[PDB]
Symmetry: C3
Subunit: 333 residues, 3 copies
């Protein structure tokens, strides 16, 4: 049966970008093959040069977004090069059985493995590393991403009418717990293992030191702001593998939102802010109507503006005065 | 076009009360004009006399609830008197473009401005001050409120049948982060700026020192409890501009609840407790069936009973023994 | 009227098990009688022997799950034996009036009382102790449980088709705040009152020291793991009386989920993780398709793996290679 199915190999791209795919399936079920290489590496996460030992899927935080269609088979080749120091694995919330695949994918440095699973449920799901005994440590070190399982006939609104996006971006939100000395300065370590004991004590406080989008404070700002034009329909996939978040587009809305990200449910309309539970991926669809800069944020404003959970959208086009206008510009009373 | 539309000026009232309005629109689209004056002031928030420098819209925490209808134009005159010390602005989650209006409304003490925007989406939305660089500081100092955009044909249940309320109250929940000395005593400052540096360190802990309704511990209790009678339909609008909350009516329920507050979505039925994400306004409809005192609370009971997030409802009418009755009064076994 | 109704006495069972009942009602409305005895007792909650003074309904944390049908009358006999030291009461989120029954059930040691209320709304609700002035202290000491009010015609899916479970388990999640000395070691007390002053300071930090299922770290693991077989439909009721949680079945899904637990609302489909607000009970239905061990967790992984919020399911049956298969077992590259 599977033997007889067609197979296509897909090369992943770095977040916030997403690999090429079809919204409405043009072929029947296929075996979609992906390859990911584990990369343990130092990463500076803020302006002051705070550095951590990140554990990544394909060298990025978050790992890349995989896109398949309902009932396709996902075949993943997972490589943990001998240059790494730790055992890793992968658990797909999209899969059924063996702890999401975690129990079948344990690879020590120098090993690899190939897992195949059927994508039976449509929606956006989280995938993350989950080694027995050190699950939270690998997850909060950036070892998580997401997979989107699109219905074979694309997205639909509450009335069952088609929703087609022109652009799609993937925003992975990460809570970090950097160990601190007595005065409050962040510690630095030589290897991941040296950090272990302190990492556990930092996590138990339940208070992140940094909460960032795309691995660093300001990663999606300035020259890295997301782009769009007035009239474009944009799908924004957002995931949080460990902690709740409440996304919000400042100056816009979520026209159609699947906060818990499962496509068989009708979306919520006209959201100002929505809650994505830790351990979940959600998706929001919006059509831009005004040009300018928009701030995309986690709406606990301390987490957004003090801790790092803030990004930008720069949109081009003509301003619509009917929607909004400054009647009297700021001036002395 | 707008030139030709009718205009009505509306005078706002202090929370928990709401200005007069029509549920079902009796006229066509109009330009609804409001005026708000910024007021920086000292406020004692608890029983022990803890005082803070609050930043308010119209002298209240939360700012007043504005009520308009879908497709009306909101025209707001914002005044920042020379007696204030800081730059302020306003961002409406109900608006589209220019950061909700924040980029078009920056006024220094002694200035004013007039913004107009089209209320294209029905629901309850949060509005708050958001000056570049000090967003969380102004929000957590009490500078936020809410606006309700009613469908032109009023509220409806899941089956599309009319829902008419007899009374409406606005509950604004506020998380405060008062700086403390080494022993745990709250600090006091002369002006807002003197508090700044310490305020930022207090906010970064992510742990509020006070979480109150209507600006103070016990503000909606005793002689200030909300009132109703058995048989009355009450709509309770609740907003939290920065942090999640989980409202609950002790002794009652939320018969119809729009937790994320957007009216084009059908409401949830028979809720015991519901989650309102930080940065959102929600609404719950309930018909009183028993008289007596009801406690309206944030259901994290530590936040409610230790931190200040608790209010009362005193309802008049006849007791219904079918619904509830004490069969055997408390007595010695 | 009530005089003329039939009455049945029901003996409760210890969580995670649930007393015998009918899904679809076979008789008309009845008076369902229950008896609960309050038990103040020492409980060791972790591996290191940390001990607390738990306040329980029927000797368990959480208290037992009561199951009735819509429009039945619940008659509860509450006994507070002279061996206890504190005043207690009970508030049912399922009831209407008198603070959920809290104002009608205040019993000092040596007293008892009988309350009756009509179960007018279908769903799973939380019930908990709530004495004026010490509400959070009794709740976070384990004094809470849940009651399920089933529609007279059983459970239904989004299309109104019947959902019948073969097994049902009750998971009560509890956040504990154990007082600590300067070095971080947990304190020990002789009686509940001796703990009081310190308990309040510990709660105000808003950071639990332990978050457990069924009263202790590892309570639902090893020989106490929940059981099922491939093909069985299982209903998992989960409650959190004070704090938000985000349940997740590792290796599975929530096929039908009522996150806020009210049955008149259609369930959410294919959830990976769902949010249950503090002060709420929810229910998830799932059909097992793969055998093996599944971890049932609160998806804030620090709370699950470091703090104690983790349990197991051991499922028997044949492995399905179509759903998942290891193509290449872990081996040297
Ligand atoms: Cu790993
Ligand atoms: Cu997971
Ligand atoms: Cu301001
Ligand atoms: Cu905002
Ligand atoms: Cu008690
Ligand atoms: Cu309660």
């Amino acid at each position: 049966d599977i033997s007889t199915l067609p197979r296509v190999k897909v090369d992943l791209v770095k977040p916030p970008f997403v690999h090429a795919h079809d919204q409405v399936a043009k072929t029947g079920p296929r075996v979609v093959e992906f390859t990911m290489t584990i990369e343990e590496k130092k990463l500076v996460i803020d302006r002051e040069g705070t550095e951590i030992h990140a554990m990544t899927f394909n060298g990025s935080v978050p790992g890349p977004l995989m896109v398949v269609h309902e009932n396709d088979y996902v075949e993943l080749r997972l490589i943990n090069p001998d240059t790494n120091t730790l055992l890793h694995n992968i658990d797909f919330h999209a899969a059924t059985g063996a702890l999401g695949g975690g129990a079948l994918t344990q690879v020590n440095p120098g090993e690899e493995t190939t897992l195949r699973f059927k994508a039976t449920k449509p929606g956006v799901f989280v995938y993350h590393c989950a080694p027995e005994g050190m699950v939270p440590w690998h997850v909060t070190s950036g070892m998580n991403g997401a997979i989107m399982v699109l219905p074979r006939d694309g997205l639909k609104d509450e009335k069952g009418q088609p929703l087609t996006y022109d652009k799609i971006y993937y925003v992975g939100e990460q809570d970090f717990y950097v160990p601190k000395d007595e005065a409050g300065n962040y510690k630095k370590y030589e290897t991941p293992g040296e950090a272990y004991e302190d990492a556990v004590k930092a996590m138990r406080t339940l208070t992140p030191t940094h909460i960032v989008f795309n691995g660093a404070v300001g990663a999606l700002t300035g020259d890295h702001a997301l782009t769009a034009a007035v009239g474009e329909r944009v799908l924004v996939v957002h995931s949080q593998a460990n902690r709740d978040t409440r996304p919000h587009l400042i100056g816009g809305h979520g026209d159609y939102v699947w906060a818990t990200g499962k496509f068989r449910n009708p979306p919520d309309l006209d959201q100002e802010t929505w809650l994505i539970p830790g351990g979940t991926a959600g998706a929001a669809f919006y059509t831009f109507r005004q040009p300018g800069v928009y701030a995309y944020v986690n709406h606990n404003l301390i987490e957004a503006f003090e801790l790092g959970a803030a990004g930008h959208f720069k949109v081009t086009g003509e301003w619509n005065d009917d929607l909004m206008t400054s009647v009297v510009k700021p001036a002395s009373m």
